[PDB]
Design a protein around this nucleic acid. Sequence first.
RNA 1: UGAUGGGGUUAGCGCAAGCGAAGCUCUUGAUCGAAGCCCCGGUAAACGGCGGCCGUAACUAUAACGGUCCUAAGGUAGCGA
Length: 58
Amino acid sequence: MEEKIIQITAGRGPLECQWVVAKVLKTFLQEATQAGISYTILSREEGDANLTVKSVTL
RNA sequence: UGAUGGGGUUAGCGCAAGCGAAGCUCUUGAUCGAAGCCCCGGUAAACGGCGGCCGUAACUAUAACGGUCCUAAGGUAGCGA
Ligand SMILES: [Mg+2]
Ligand SMILES: [Mg+2]
Ligand SMILES: [Mg+2]
Ligand SMILES: [Mg+2]
């Protein structure tokens, strides 16, 4: 068994990048569920609007 | 309560194994037989009991929601380390 830590970030990117971090996160979890890798969130970095995330650590 | 049935006895009859009248007596328990119980409803300010699992919301989180399993019904208001 392996445990790892990864971060998905918008860097210095604009709000669109801040938003795609969220969409990519949702897809990433919707794949981790089928892969059987349990996922937990350590630091969700909410973005500059609704529904945005600057970065999230899994 | 005592119907039938099966015995025990013996007057008689039998070469004689045996049959057995009536009476008496032993046993059997047909029929009758109410409550109760089973049965059918009521009743919890009667004694009492008052559920599981799983998923689910433009972001993560939670589940308003949904699926099926069971129950007699799944803890209402209110309160809650
Ligand atoms: Mg999602
Ligand atoms: Mg009632
Ligand atoms: Mg309540
Ligand atoms: Mg305390």
